[PDB]
Curated annotation (Swiss-Prot):
It comes from Achromobacter denitrificans. The keyword Nucleotide-binding does not apply. The gene is azu. Keywords: Copper, Disulfide bond, Electron transport, Metal-binding, Periplasm, Signal, Transport. This is Azurin. Pfam families: Copper-bind. CDD domains: Azurin. GO terms for cellular component: periplasmic space. Residues 1-129 form the Plastocyanin-like domain. The keyword Signal applies. GO terms for molecular function: copper ion binding; electron transfer activity. It comes from the Bacteria. Disulfide bonds join C3-C26.
Length: 129
């Protein structure tokens, strides 16, 4: 929605958008994550983490090991292009990142690194015009 997108997660490990396209006129892009469920963040919190499709399992494992105070993302993790905070039901969070961190054509993985969620709660991001 110009250089912005909103994506929702509910009380299942699902994003409502499975693919996001960043328009090639965008220098910055903003993701608004909303958790439209009603469950607590220690029970079913969710975040949105963007990495190259390669770095997903590695970031997810180190992310799980980082703990909730770190929003389940390793601090200063060089492989993380952008990430939101972990939010609970009824909350939302946004993150804006620079599109020149993305190579054209190339597919990126966005996923949730809350414990146990990475393999299910995931999607694809690509740059296109
Ligand atoms: Cu999740």
């Amino acid at each position: 929605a110009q250089c912005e997108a909103t994506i929702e997660s509910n009380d299942a490990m699902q994003y409502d958008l499975k693919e996001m396209v960043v328009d090639k006129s965008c220098k910055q892009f903003t993701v608004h994550l909303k958790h439209v469920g009603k469950m607590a963040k220690s029970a079913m919190g969710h975040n949105w983490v963007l990495t190259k499709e390669a770095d997903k399992e590695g970031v997810a494992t180190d992310g799980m090991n980082a703990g909730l105070a770190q929003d389940y993302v390793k601090a200063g993790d060089t492989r993380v292009i952008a990430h939101t905070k972990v939010i609970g039901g009824g909350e939302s969070d946004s993150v804006t990142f620079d599109v020149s961190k993305l190579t054209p054509g190339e597919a990126y993985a966005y996923f949730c690194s809350f414990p146990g969620h990475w393999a299910m709660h995931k999607g694809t991001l690509k740059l296109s015009n």
